[PDB]
């Protein structure tokens, strides 16, 4: 238990903050209220729904767009089931974009993707995850591999174009370690 490990700043906090150590006598009250409000906390992911259908229409012929629109409707229906209709149209469209991006490089439903959808929208029917994954793989089956790399580059670029404070700053993950000394020699 690492919450147990004896630390100087732990002792320092305990001495003047008796108050606060069992102030955090909070567990799933703590995380639950987070789940309560996480519904609108995700604005968007890498690529929004409008960006996705722009890409699809820009890269594929009308021939295959005909079928891809039914696939996208399957994804929209799956998002409707997962997101729910009371948050509204744009919410289920961003959920559909999240679904598409979840499965655009994966051909099956895995522990990672179920857990990701649950993290984003709470518990959900996995049948809809299957439906959305099937529709997404149907769509990607029309991509050429140049098209697929274009999509990957587009996701990577927009994630890279995000700006946050201290983004371009130099940063080191080197942390203070034990200095190397030498083993207690052999006794006797």
């Amino acid at each position: 238990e690492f919450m147990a490990l004896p630390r100087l700043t732990g002792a320092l906090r305990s001495f003047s903050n008796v108050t606060k150590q069992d102030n955090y006598n909070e567990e799933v009250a703590d995380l639950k209220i987070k789940r309560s409000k996480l519904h609108e906390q995700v604005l968007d992911l890498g690529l929004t729904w409008k960006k996705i259908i722009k890409f699809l229409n820009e890269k594929l012929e009308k021939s295959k767009m005909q079928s891809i629109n039914e696939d996208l409707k399957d994804i929209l229906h799956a998002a409707k089931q997962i997101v729910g209709t009371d948050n509204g149209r744009e919410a289920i469209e961003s959920g559909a974009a999240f679904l598409f991006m979840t499965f655009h490089l994966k051909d099956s439903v895995g522990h990672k993707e179920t857990k990701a959808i649950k993290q984003m929208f709470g518990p959900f029917p996995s049948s809809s995850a299957t439906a959305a994954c099937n529709a997404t793989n149907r769509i990607i089956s029309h991509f050429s591999q140049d098209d697929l790399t274009a999509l990957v580059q587009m996701t990577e670029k927009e994630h890279g174009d995000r700006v946050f404070f201290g983004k371009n700053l130099a940063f080191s993950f080197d942390m203070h370690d034990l200095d190397h000394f030498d083993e207690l020699p052999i006794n006797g």
């Binding site: 690492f2 919450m3 004896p6 209220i33 987070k34 370690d177 200095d179 083993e183 006794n187």
Partner: protein
């Protein structure tokens, strides 16, 4: 012109229907309603069920922090000042995040990648809050800024120590700037440090009192005590010395505050009391646990090295560095402080021997002798003859 944030006004609607009143920029309900959960460190071995609990909590924290860094200057500062969950989340991370020198397992790359994300994001958040001039338009009045800092508990003394030991090896020059800036803009942290020093020293005596070394009725010496109680003692000591040393490596201006509490002597005598007994006990009981006792030996030697480095940092900052600079030739008090410090630990022969081995005393005495126009051997001879005899007691 550019108006600093603390005094800038933004128009907002009041409770009354269709009525606009100008009001300060920073305000409780201009803060966002994003909840912040506390941070818990990963399990000690890669138990799948525990790993995913940690992963859930950690992704909440990391997503919130990514968004917080995305926020603008006005709304980010509103959030940090008025959302108590945020500050408590950051305190949680600083208090509980595993340090590298801790006993560490390799774990799945998911936990490693996530931990790296959290590390970088937390450092950048603390940079943002340490800076009072994000840029030309977005800045805060120095006097108002330090008030904000101290007083929404944004910076503790423990949080500063944590910050240094966590980010000081790699990102030193930046963290120097941060810590120096918060101490400059709000000097009451010095006092905070002051009030914290009695507790810090108390730590050391507790260690002594726990090994029966020195109202705790006779506890067992390290040779007798149960193994993992000894493990905890030296783990606590190692964490304590590393944290103190890292703090003084980032912010050496603190040293005088330390020496006001007779720190050089306290750690010298603690060294004398604690180090020999624990050394002998670890050596004797090495075969009770081959691997554990060697790790404890590594940690003990690391702690001794860090203690002596602390000693020398303080000595230099309050005597040697002032002499080298600013040589208007009024350095007697500095010289006298040096001499007093060593006169008070002449008898600590084991500490003297090791300390001289690492930072030779003769080399620092010659600094005083060079700087003073009028320094006779009388004033330092005994100190050297202490050092000599300290070595002569042992066969090297």
């Amino acid at each position: 012109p550019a108006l600093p944030l603390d005094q800038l006004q933004i128009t907002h609607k009041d409770p009354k229907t269709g009525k606009l009143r100008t009001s300060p920029a920073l305000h409780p309900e201009q803060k966002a309603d994003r909840y912040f959960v506390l941070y818990k460190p990963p399990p000690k071995d890669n138990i799948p069920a525990l790993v995913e609990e940690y992963l859930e909590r950690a992704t909440f924290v990391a997503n919130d922090l990514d968004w917080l860094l995305a926020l603008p200057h006005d709304k980010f500062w509103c959030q940090v000042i008025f959302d108590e969950t945020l500050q408590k989340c950051l305190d949680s991370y600083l208090r509980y995040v595993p340090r590298k020198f801790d006993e560490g397992v390799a774990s799945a790359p998911e936990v490693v990648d996530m931990q790296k994300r959290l590390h970088r994001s937390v450092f950048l958040t603390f940079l943002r809050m340490s800076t009072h001039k994000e840029s030309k338009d977005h800045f805060i009045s120095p006097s108002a800024f330090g008030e904000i800092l101290y007083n929404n508990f944004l910076f503790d003394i423990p949080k500063i120590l944590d910050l240094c030991v966590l980010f000081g090896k790699g990102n030193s020059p930046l963290l120097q700037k941060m810590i120096g800036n918060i101490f400059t803009q709000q000097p009451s942290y010095y006092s905070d440090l002051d009030e914290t020093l009695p507790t810090i020293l108390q730590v050391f005596s507790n260690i002594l009192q726990h090994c029966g070394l020195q109202e705790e009725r006779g506890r067992l010496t390290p040779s007798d005590m149960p193994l993992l109680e000894l493990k905890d003692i030296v783990l606590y000591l190692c964490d304590t010395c590393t944290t103190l040393w890292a703090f003084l490596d980032i912010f050496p201006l603190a040293c005088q505050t330390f020496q006001k509490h007779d720190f050089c002597y306290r750690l010298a005598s603690f060294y004398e009391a604690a180090i020999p007994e624990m050394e002998s006990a670890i050596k004797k009981r090495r075969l009770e646990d081959s691997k554990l006792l060697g790790d404890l030996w590594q940690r003990l030697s690391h702690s001794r090295k860090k203690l002596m480095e602390i000693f020398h940092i303080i000595l230099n900052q309050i005597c040697l560095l002032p002499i080298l600079e600013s040589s208007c030739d009024n350095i007697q008090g500095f010289i006298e402080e040096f001499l007093q410090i060593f006169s008070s630990l002449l008898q600590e022969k084991r500490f003297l021997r090791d300390y001289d081995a690492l930072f030779p005393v003769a080399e620092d005495i010659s600094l005083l002798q060079q700087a003073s126009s009028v320094l006779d051997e009388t004033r330092t001879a005994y100190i050297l003859q202490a050092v000599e005899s300290a070595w002569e007691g042992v066969d090297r």
